[PDB]
């Protein structure tokens, strides 16, 4: 947990396009929404954490409890049952809807929070760099 705490800046990412051009989390919108996520606030809370997708066009935020599943709708997932936990030092967000699921596994080693976004077909590396 002792990493996530703070405000991050997106640095490296690719393949959002493909991934949405299949998942249906844009199929168009993500052609800009691929890039347009410069900041992400990650406020750890007591037993919990809240993500704040601070960007220009489109913002989202949701609270999640490491060790629970919650049914919730981010604009860029739709309604999905997110199960979150922390294995070793890896924040595994598995994201279970129905016909498929996806995985949003987060870790910081070195100085970058690497988020591996993996679905039933398609992958994206999404990397975040602590700005504050």
UniProtKB/Swiss-Prot annotation:
Keywords: Acetylation, Cytoplasm, Lipid-binding, Mitochondrion, Phosphoprotein, Transport. Hexadecanoate binds at residues 126-128. Forms a beta-barrel structure that accommodates the hydrophobic ligand in its interior. This is Fatty acid-binding protein, heart. The modification Phosphothreonine is found at residues 7, 29. Gene3D superfamilies: 2.40.128.20. FABPs are thought to play a role in the intracellular transport of long-chain fatty acids and their acyl-CoA esters. MDGI reversibly inhibits proliferation of mammary carcinoma cells. Belongs to the calycin superfamily. Fatty-acid binding protein (FABP) family. It comes from Bos taurus (Bovine). The lineage of its organism: Eukaryota, Metazoa, Chordata, Craniata, Vertebrata. It comes from the Eukaryota. The modification N-acetylvaline is found at residue 1. PANTHER family: FATTY ACID BINDING PROTEIN. GO terms for biological process: long-chain fatty acid transport. The gene is FABP3. InterPro entries: Calycin, Fatty_acid-bd, ILBP, Lipocln_cytosolic_FA-bd_dom. Mammary epithelial cells of developing lobuloalveolar structures and heart. The modification Phosphotyrosine is found at residue 19.
């Amino acid at each position: 947990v002792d990493a996530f705490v703070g405000t991050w800046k997106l640095v490296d990412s690719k393949n959002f396009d493909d991934y949405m051009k299949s998942l249906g989390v844009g199929f168009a919108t993500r052609q800009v929404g691929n890039m347009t996520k410069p900041t992400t606030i990650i406020e750890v809370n007591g037993d919990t954490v809240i993500i704040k997708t601070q960007s220009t066009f489109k913002n989202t935020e949701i609270s999640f409890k490491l060790g629970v599943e919650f049914d919730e709708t981010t604009a860029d997932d739709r309604k999905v049952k997110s199960i979150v936990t922390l294995d070793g030092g890896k924040l595994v967000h598995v994201q279970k809807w129905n016909g498929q699921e996806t995985s949003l596994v987060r870790e910081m080693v070195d100085g970058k929070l690497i988020l591996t976004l993996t679905h039933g077909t398609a992958v994206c590396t999404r990397t975040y760099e602590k700005q504050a």
